[PDB]
Amino acid sequence: QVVKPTDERIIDPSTANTQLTGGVCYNTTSGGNKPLAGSPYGYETWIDTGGGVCSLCWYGADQGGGAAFKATWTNPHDFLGRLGYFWNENKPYSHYENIYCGFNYTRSGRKTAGDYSYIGIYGWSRNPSASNSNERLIEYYIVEDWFGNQWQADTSPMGINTTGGTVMGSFTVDGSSYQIIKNTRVNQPSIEGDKTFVQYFSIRQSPRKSGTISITEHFKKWEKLGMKLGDNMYECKFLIEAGAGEGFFDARLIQFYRADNEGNILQITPHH
Template structure:
């Protein structure tokens, strides 16, 4: 039995006029002077997060099923997918997988890097993980930003290189901490396909990378120093599923209901660059990211 726990389409538009539909995530526009917004999407069991460093950047969740991000000139991180009330290890879940398809229109990509894939977090220990299927990295010779290459493995028709780096000075309830970040980067980029997410979890652990209790598994779109030459980027669908585990039961995804804590949290991009601090508020679910 397969349980569809997130299905969505998203369009990234930069400098392109779009039709405006009714919104299902009205808090997805960071307020004036703010850089971060988060919340849940109406009639779904998933959450969203939008971070921007610039002006005129926002996420739109439309009733017609499309998802739009507008950014005239900004860095942007967009995540959407399920969060879990009670984090569990991946072997306590079913098998996670994703199927997706997207297309691009317009001019070239005027950005040092642009990424599409899966991103999530764990606790006990605190880690971040990335599975990147589509990427544009201008300076491919400089791999130091990804940390240390630990190995490779083949799954879903291609080889993924596995990397690890460290994010420092993360503010937590225990004070400032550092944590590991795991990366699986597909060698041949593609615009559609299947991602066996659990296979990556298993391979990371084979290499000694501890995968803790999973708090979220989300689709990721991330761009750094984007320019208006990116005219249109549309994901037709990005479906994350969780199949029955070996006991024959199917894990159930629920909308996260844990309260946000007051305080600051540091925000990093995929390559470990410090972006700013997020001031968390109890309600509404919006964080203001203070410029560094």
């Protein structure tokens, strides 16, 4: 009933594999969202100065779908680099209609990002009227891929022994089953200081490095399981997170777009 967009501006992710150049790089923690010149997107870096060199380099407004970046880490302590929509304007997810992200990247191999690592979609939402005070702040992940570790192959999806928490259910979208996990973070660092909050994960059962993520489909399935997002979405960004190791992530394509149920474009980036 939701019509997939067929607009020509959408770049086919499967063949979007030309190496990009001319990045603009950020080598320190950004202190939250920082807007990008001539772009609807913002970036954020979390680069612990107790670890080694990390960077995020944005490929600019006019190539690679507009949100493409490369990141590098050298023995970080939980590096996070992310880029995409920054919202935080008191609106629930449904306000943004159907959100999609087409992507294509290369990365370093197995065991180059420490014991845990995440690639995919990430953000937060606030739900102050939730009766359970634990559920008034939400951190969320849609996990397309990871680097595995010494114990587990990067071809094998991570489980609750990496994420923590409880398997709530699953569904199939964009060519794979996704396991849905809820975890409670007890008195942990957050966008609101040290506190208790919840995390929602969809873990792609068949990891991949290119494709399209039907982000809104995850949000709907979470809410059906009682994993509510509330009424103030913070952001919706493409993330690389590396617990440790020495590696890289290098996107040839990250294209966000939003469409209504008829499949008409609401927002997209970017004569013969």
